[PDB]
Amino acid sequence: KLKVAVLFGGSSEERDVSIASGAQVIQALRSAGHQVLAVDTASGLLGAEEERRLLASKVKEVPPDSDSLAIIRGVDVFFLALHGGTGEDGTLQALLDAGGFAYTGSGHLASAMAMDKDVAKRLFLAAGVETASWLMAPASEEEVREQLGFPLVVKPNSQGSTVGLSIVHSQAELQPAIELAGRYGDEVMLERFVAGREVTVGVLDDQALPVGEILLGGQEVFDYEHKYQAGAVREVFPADLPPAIAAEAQRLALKVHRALKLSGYSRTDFRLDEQGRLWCLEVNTLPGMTATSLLPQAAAAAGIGFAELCERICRLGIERC
Amino acid sequence: KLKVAVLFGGSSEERDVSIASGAQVIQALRSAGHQVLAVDTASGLLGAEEERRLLASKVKEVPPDSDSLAILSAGELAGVDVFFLALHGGTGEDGTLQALLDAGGFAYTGSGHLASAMAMDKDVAKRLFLAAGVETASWLMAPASEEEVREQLGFPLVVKPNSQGSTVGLSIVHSQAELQPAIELAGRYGDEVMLERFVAGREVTVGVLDDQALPVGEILLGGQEVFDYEHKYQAGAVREVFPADLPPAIAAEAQRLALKVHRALKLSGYSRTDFRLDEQGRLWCLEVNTLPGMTATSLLPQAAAAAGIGFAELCERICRLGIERC
Numbered sequence A: 001k002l003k004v005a006v007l008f009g010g011s012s013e014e015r016d017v018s019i020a021s022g023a024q025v026i027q028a029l030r031s032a033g034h035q036v037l038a039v040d041t042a043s044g045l046l047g048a049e050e051e052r053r054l055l056a057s058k059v060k061e062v063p064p065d066s067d068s069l070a071i072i073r074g075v076d077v078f079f080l081a082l083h084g085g086t087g088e089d090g091t092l093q094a095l096l097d098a099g100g101f102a103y104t105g106s107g108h109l110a111s112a113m114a115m116d117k118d119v120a121k122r123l124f125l126a127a128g129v130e131t132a133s134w135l136m137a138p139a140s141e142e143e144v145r146e147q148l149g150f151p152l153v154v155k156p157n158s159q160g161s162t163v164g165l166s167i168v169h170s171q172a173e174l175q176p177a178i179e180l181a182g183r184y185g186d187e188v189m190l191e192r193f194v195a196g197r198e199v200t201v202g203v204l205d206d207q208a209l210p211v212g213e214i215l216l217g218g219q220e221v222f223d224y225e226h227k228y229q230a231g232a233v234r235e236v237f238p239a240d241l242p243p244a245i246a247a248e249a250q251r252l253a254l255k256v257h258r259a260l261k262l263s264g265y266s267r268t269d270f271r272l273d274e275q276g277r278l279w280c281l282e283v284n285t286l287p288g289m290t291a292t293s294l295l296p297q298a299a300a301a302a303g304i305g306f307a308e309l310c311e312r313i314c315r316l317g318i319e320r321c
Numbered sequence B: 001k002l003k004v005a006v007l008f009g010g011s012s013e014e015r016d017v018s019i020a021s022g023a024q025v026i027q028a029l030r031s032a033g034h035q036v037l038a039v040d041t042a043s044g045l046l047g048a049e050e051e052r053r054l055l056a057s058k059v060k061e062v063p064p065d066s067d068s069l070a071i072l073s074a075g076e077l078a079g080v081d082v083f084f085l086a087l088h089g090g091t092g093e094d095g096t097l098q099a100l101l102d103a104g105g106f107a108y109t110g111s112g113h114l115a116s117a118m119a120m121d122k123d124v125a126k127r128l129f130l131a132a133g134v135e136t137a138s139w140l141m142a143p144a145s146e147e148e149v150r151e152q153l154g155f156p157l158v159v160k161p162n163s164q165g166s167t168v169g170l171s172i173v174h175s176q177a178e179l180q181p182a183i184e185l186a187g188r189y190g191d192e193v194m195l196e197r198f199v200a201g202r203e204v205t206v207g208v209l210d211d212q213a214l215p216v217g218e219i220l221l222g223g224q225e226v227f228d229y230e231h232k233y234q235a236g237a238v239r240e241v242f243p244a245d246l247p248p249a250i251a252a253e254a255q256r257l258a259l260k261v262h263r264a265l266k267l268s269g270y271s272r273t274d275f276r277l278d279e280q281g282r283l284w285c286l287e288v289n290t291l292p293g294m295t296a297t298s299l300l301p302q303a304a305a306a307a308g309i310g311f312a313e314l315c316e317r318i319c320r321l322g323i324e325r326c
C-alpha cells in the first residue's frame, strides 16, 4: 500500500472539474487501502468533513470565472488531480522535479507541449497525425477568409473543458470570439471546423484503450455543460465504429502520446468526418477523472476498474520518477 | 536604474562557463549603474571579496568532472526588479528554473518555461525547425540499428546528448564500430542521445536580440571537424569573424532562418542559433540556445558589438525585455 497525496483544486478555470476529479480519486484510492492526503492547492490539507463536502460538490453549469476565480487566485507519490493552468502546463511538474518528489502523469516538457495546442499540432503533423488547418491570432480577416474560411473554431491556445471556445459562422462573429478566448489566456487559435463525429482515445502505460464516441445530437461542439452534467450526453465505449477506423484512431493516439514524450496516461480527441477521416484536435496529459469523465469509461471498457486505474497511474509515476 | 540579481554557476557541466558569463554580466550591469547582487545557485549570495575570487575563475580546457558536480525573496533579494539568468545547461536553461520563477511571480531574463524546454530538447527543436521551413540534418534517436544508421545517416555522423551545451558529450563517429562507445559517452551526460548526419563545411552563428538578427559570425576551425570545449572558451584558440566573410545572400538567409527559429520556438529576449554551411552553400540548423554564452570569448557579445551594441547596453536591454515579458 502507498501513501498518496492527491493534489487538486488549483486556480485555473477547471478548478471545479479538478475538485470533482480529486474527490473520485481520493475515494477510489482509500477504497483500495491506501493512505491518502487530500490537498487543495488553493488552501492546503483538508479534514474529513471538508473532504466529505468536496466529494458532494458537483461541477456547476459555468466554470469559475471573473471575480469569483480572482478571489481564489512520507508521501510515496503526488497524484495530480489538477487540470489546466500551472497544474497541467508543466509548471507544477518542474517544481516537483526540483523538490525530488514523485508524481503522476507527464513530465514538465511533455506537459508544456501538450498544453500548447499550436505546438502540439505541429508535432502531430511531424508524426504523421492529420490535424485541421489553423492560424494564431492576430490574423487579418483577409488571411482568415483565405486560409480557413467559415465555419471555424476560435479557442484559447491553452485552456481545457471547452473554456473560451466559440464556433464562428461568419466574419461578424470572429472578433467577439477572439476577445472571449483572450480572457482565458494569452494566445488564441483559429482552426478549421471539422463537421462530423466526436471520438476520443485514452492511453494507459503505452497501450490504447477502447475508442469512445460522444453523441452530440444537434450540437456543433462538446461544451462545458455537456462534459460535466450527469446524463447530458450519451457516451459510448467501445464506440460504434467500423473496426478499421477505431484501430486507426488508436494507432494515431499512440503516435501522439509518443511524439510528445508523454508518460503514464493521456487522452486524445478527434473529429471524424463523413469521409472516414480522423482529425486530431489535441491531447490531454491530465484528463478528467470525474464521475462523468471519459478516461474512466475507456478504462472500464478495457476491463480496468476505477481504483485499479488510479493505482496503476500512481505506480507508473513512481516508476518514472 | 534596476536592482538585478545575477544567478550563475549551477551544477551542469557548463558551470565554469556560467561563472564566467555571470562575472561578465555583473561587471557590465555595474558599469551601467544598476545595483547587482551575485548569486551562485550552488551556494548562495556572494560578498565583495568572494565575488573577486569566484568571478575571476577562468574557464579551463576541460569541463568539470562528474564527481565535482555531484559534490529567492530572502533578505537581500527583496525588491529585485529582475533575475538575470547567467546559467547554462541543466535546470537553469531547460525551463525548470523558469517555472520556479514563474511560480514565485519573479521577473527573469531570456525565454519562458515552454520555450526553454523545447530549445533544450535538440530533437523536438529540430522537428519544429522543419515545421517552420528551416533546413536541418537528418537524425535518429538512440537506439538505432546498424541498418537504420547505414540507410538514413551514413558515416561520419555526430553523436551528441539531446540536451547538453558547450560540445559536452559529443563525438564524431567515423564507422559503425565507434558508434556504441559514442552513445555510451553521450549517455553519461543526459537521458536521450541523438545521432545526426554530419554536415561538412563552415561553422556559422546568428544572434537575435528582441526580434532582430545581429551580424552573422563565422568560426574558423582550421582542420577541425567540430567546435569543441577547449576552442570555445580559451581566448584566441580560433578566429571568430563578425560580420562573417560570406556572400551577402547567404548571410541574409542565415539571419532570416534564425529569426524563423526564434519565433517558431516562442523564444523571448535574445537567442543564438548555430548552423553548418555545407560545401554547396546550403545552411543546416543545428540548434538554438536560449541562454547563450556571455563570456569574454563568447559569440553573442561579439555579434552585438558588430551591430553597434556594447556589452553593458546588451545586458541592460535583456533585463528590460525580461521585465516587460513578466
Ligand SMILES: Nc1ncnc2c1ncn2[C@@H]1O[C@H](COP(=O)(O)OP(=O)(O)OP(=O)(O)O)[C@@H](O)[C@H]1O
Residues within 6 Å of the ligand: A132, A153, A155, A159, A160, A161, A162, A163, A165, A191, A192, A193, A194, A195, A198, A220, A221, A222, A223, A227, A269, A271, A281, A282, A284
Ligand atoms: N476544429 C474543430 N472542429 C470541430 N469541433 C471542434 C474543433 N475544435 C474543438 N472542437 C469542439 O470543441 C471541443 C473542445 O475542443 P478541444 O478538445 O480542442 O479543447 P479543450 O477545451 O482542451 O477540451 P478538454 O475538455 O478535452 O480538455 C471538442 O471536443 C469539439 O467538440
Ligand SMILES: Nc1ncnc2c1ncn2[C@@H]1O[C@H](COP(=O)(O)OP(=O)(O)OP(=O)(O)O)[C@@H](O)[C@H]1O
Residues within 6 Å of the ligand: B137, B158, B160, B164, B165, B166, B167, B168, B170, B196, B197, B198, B199, B200, B203, B225, B226, B227, B228, B274, B276, B286, B287, B289
Ligand atoms: N550535425 C553536425 N555536423 C557537423 N558538425 C556538427 C554537427 N552537430 C554538431 N556539430 C559540431 O559540434 C558543435 C556543437 O554542436 P551543437 O551546437 O549542436 O551543441 P551544443 O553543445 O549545444 O553547443 P553550444 O556550445 O553552442 O551550446 C557545433 O558547433 C559543430 O562544430
Ligand SMILES: [Mg+2]
Residues within 6 Å of the ligand: A159, A160, A161, A282, A283, A284
Ligand atoms: Mg484539453
Ligand SMILES: [Mg+2]
Residues within 6 Å of the ligand: A269, A281, A282
Ligand atoms: Mg478536448
Ligand SMILES: [Mg+2]
Residues within 6 Å of the ligand: B164, B165, B166, B287, B288, B289
Ligand atoms: Mg547549445
Ligand SMILES: [Mg+2]
Residues within 6 Å of the ligand: B274, B286, B287
Ligand atoms: Mg551550438
